[PDB]
Amino acid sequence: KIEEGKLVIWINGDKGYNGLAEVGKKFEKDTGIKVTVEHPDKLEEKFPQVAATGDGPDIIFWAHDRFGGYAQSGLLAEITPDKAFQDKLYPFTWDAVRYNGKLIAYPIAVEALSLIYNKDLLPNPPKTWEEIPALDKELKAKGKSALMFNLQEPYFTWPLIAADGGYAFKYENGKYDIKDVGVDNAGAKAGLTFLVDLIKNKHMNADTDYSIAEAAFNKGETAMTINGPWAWSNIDTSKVNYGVTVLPTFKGQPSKPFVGVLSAGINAASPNKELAKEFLENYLLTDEGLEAVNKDKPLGAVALKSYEEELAKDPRIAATMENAQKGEIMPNIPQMSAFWYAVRTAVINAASGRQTVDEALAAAQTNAAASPTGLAGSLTNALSNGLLSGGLLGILENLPLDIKVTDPQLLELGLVQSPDGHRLYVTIPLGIKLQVNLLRLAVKLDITAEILAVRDKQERIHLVLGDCTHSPGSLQISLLDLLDSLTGILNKVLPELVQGNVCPLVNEVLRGLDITLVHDIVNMLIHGLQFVIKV
Numbered sequence: 001k002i003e004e005g006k007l008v009i010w011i012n013g014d015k016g017y018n019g020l021a022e023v024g025k026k027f028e029k030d031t032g033i034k035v036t037v038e039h040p041d042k043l044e045e046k047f048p049q050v051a052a053t054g055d056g057p058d059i060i061f062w063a064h065d066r067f068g069g070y071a072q073s074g075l076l077a078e079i080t081p082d083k084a085f086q087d088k089l090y091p092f093t094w095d096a097v098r099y100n101g102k103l104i105a106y107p108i109a110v111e112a113l114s115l116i117y118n119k120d121l122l123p124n125p126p127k128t129w130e131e132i133p134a135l136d137k138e139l140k141a142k143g144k145s146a147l148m149f150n151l152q153e154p155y156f157t158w159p160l161i162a163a164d165g166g167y168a169f170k171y172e173n174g175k176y177d178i179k180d181v182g183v184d185n186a187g188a189k190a191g192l193t194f195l196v197d198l199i200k201n202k203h204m205n206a207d208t209d210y211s212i213a214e215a216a217f218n219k220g221e222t223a224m225t226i227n228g229p230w231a232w233s234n235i236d237t238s239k240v241n242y243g244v245t246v247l248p249t250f251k252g253q254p255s256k257p258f259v260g261v262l263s264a265g266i267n268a269a270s271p272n273k274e275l276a277k278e279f280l281e282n283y284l285l286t287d288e289g290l291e292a293v294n295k296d297k298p299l300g301a302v303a304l305k306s307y308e309e310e311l312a313k314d315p316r317i318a319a320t321m322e323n324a325q326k327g328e329i330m331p332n333i334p335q336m337s338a339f340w341y342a343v344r345t346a347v348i349n350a351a352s353g354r355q356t357v358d359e360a361l362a363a364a365q366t367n368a369a370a371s372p373t374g375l376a377g378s379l380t381n382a383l384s385n386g387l388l389s390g391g392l393l394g395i396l397e398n399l400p401l402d403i404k405v406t407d408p409q410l411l412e413l414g415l416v417q418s419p420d421g422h423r424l425y426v427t428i429p430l431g432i433k434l435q436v437n438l439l440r441l442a443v444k445l446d447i448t449a450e451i452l453a454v455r456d457k458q459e460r461i462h463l464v465l466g467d468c469t470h471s472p473g474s475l476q477i478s479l480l481d482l483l484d485s486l487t488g489i490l491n492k493v494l495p496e497l498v499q500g501n502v503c504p505l506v507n508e509v510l511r512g513l514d515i516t517l518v519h520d521i522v523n524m525l526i527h528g529l530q531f532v533i534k535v
C-alpha cells in the first residue's frame with residue numbers, strides 16, 4: 001500500500017511542514033518524483049501501528065528518543081550516508097541516531113533548555129545556581145521573584161540534578177546499558193537538596209508548573225525562567241525584553257540538560273529507501289532546504305554545521321547549542337519510560353517533603369532500572385543477584401596467599417546459546433585487587449558453566465548445571481598504581497581453587513531462580529528456540 005515511485009513524509013504539526021513541502025517541490029522538479037507531506041495527529045503512535053502492518057510513510061520525522069524503540073521493532077531501515085556527508089553534521093547529533101552500532105536516521109535539529117532572563121530586571125544574569133537566593137531577597141523587596149520554572153516535570157529539574165556526573169542510562173557506542181542508571185550520586189543529592197532548600201527558603205514554590213512559570217515570566221513578575229525554544233514566541237508577544245543564555249553552573253559544574261534531536265527515519269517497509277536518502281541528503285539537509293523549513297516554522301538550532309553557523313548569529317540559538325553541547329543526549333530506548341516515572345515521583349516527593357532527598361533518589365535509582373526483560377536478561381540478573389546474596393564476594397575475599405585481597409567483584413555475565421538452541425553456556429567474570437605490603441594488582445578471570453535441561457522421575461524436567469570450569473586462558477593480572485610469574489603461579493592454583501569454591505554456589509543459585517523463569521527457559525531449550533542475543 002506504500003507506493004514505489006513517490007515519497008510520503010510524516011512530520012509533526014508544530015514543525016515547518018509547509019517549508020518542507022517546498023523542499024519536496026524542488027525535488028519533484030529535479031527528479032519528477034512526487035513528495036507528499038502529512039502531519040497526522042499522534043504520528044508517533046500511528047507510525048508503529050501502521051508500519052508494523054508494512055504500511056505508513058516512507059520517512060518519519062520525530063524526536064530521536066523514539067527511534068531506538070522503532071529500530072528494535074524492526075521498523076526503521078539502516079541509513080547509509082558516506083563519511084563526507086556525516087562530516088557535514090555535528091558528531092554528537094549522530095550519536096543520538098545510533099542504535100547498536102548502526103545509524104538509524106538523519107539528524108535535523110537540536111534542542112535543549114536554556115536560562116531565559118528579563119534584561120530589564122536582570123541585565124547581567126548569574127552564572128551560578130548559588131547566587132540565586134541572594135538575588136531573590138533583593139528582588140522580593142521590589143515585589144518580584146528571582147527564578148520560576150516548572151518543578152512538576154523532571155525534564156526541567158534534571159539539568160541541575162545531573163550536573164555532576166549524573167546520567168539516565170549509560171551510553172556505549174549507540175548502546176545504552178539499561179542496568180546502569182546514573183540517577184543517584186553526590187551531585188544529584190546536592191543538586192536536589194539545593195532545589196528543596198529553595199522551596200524551604202521561600203525562593204521557589206513546590207506547586208509551580210509550566211503555566212505558572214510561563215505567566216510569571218511573561219508578565220515580568222520573575223527575573224529568570226528555564227525553558228526551550230518552543231517557549232520563545234509567547235515571550236515575543238509578551239513584550240518582555242529577554243535574553244537566552246547558558247544555564248547556571250552548580251558547584252562549578254555546568255547544568256546538564258537533556259538534548260532532543262529532531263530526526264528523519266526511513267521506513268523499513270519503504271520501496272523508496274534510495275529516493276528517501278537522496279531527498280534527505282541532497283535536498284533537505286542543505287543551507288537552502290533547512291532555510292525553507294526554518295522560515296515556515298523555526299527549527300531552533302540545527303545539526304547541519306553550515307546552516308547552524310548562520311543561525312547562531314541569533315544569540316538565543318547559539319545559547320541553545322551551547323546548552324546542548326554541555327547536555328546529555330536523551331537515551332533513545334523505551335526503558336526511558338520507567339526512568340521518567342521514577343525521577344518524576346522522586347522530585348515531586350522531595351519537593352512536597354513526602355520523602356527526604358536521599359530517600360527519593362535511592363528509590364528512583366532502583367526503580368528506573370526495574371524494567372523487566374526477556375528470558376536471557378532475566379536469567380543473568382537472577383544469577384548475579386543470586387551469587388551476591390549467596391555471598392560470592394565474601395568467598396572471594398577469603399581466598400589466601402603479604403596479601404590482603406580486596407575489592408571483590410562480580411562482573412557482567414556472558415550468555416551463549418547452542419546453534420541448535422538446546423544448550424546454554426554462561427560466562428562468569430570475577431575480580432579482586434591484590435595488595436602486597438605497596439604493589440597493588442588487579443586479578444580477573446572467567447568461569448564457564450553449562451546450563452542443561454534434563455528429564456528425571458523420569459517424566460519431570462529440571463534445569464541443571466553442566467560442567468563448571470575455570471576458563472583456561474581467561475586469567476588476567478593487571479598492574480595498579482612480578483608477572484608473568486605471578487600469573488604463571490596463579491594459573492596453577494586459582495583456576496582449580498575458584499571453580500571449587502564457586503561452581504557449588506553457582507549450582508545453588510541456579511535452583512533458587514523464579515520457577516516460571518525456569519520452566520519458560522526449559523521450554524525453549526527443549527524446542528531449540530533462540531532467546532539469546534548475538535553481541
Ligand SMILES: CCCCCCCCO[C@@H]1O[C@H](CO)[C@@H](O)[C@H](O)[C@H]1O
Pocket residue numbers: 022023026030282283284286288289292
Ligand atoms: C526551497 C527548496 C530548496 C531545497 C533544495 C536544495 C539544493 C538542491 O539542489 C539540487 O542538488 C542536486 C544534487 O545534489 C542537483 O541534481 C540539482 O541540480 C540541484 O538543483
Ligand SMILES: [Mg+2]
Pocket residue numbers: 090091092093
Ligand atoms: Mg560534536
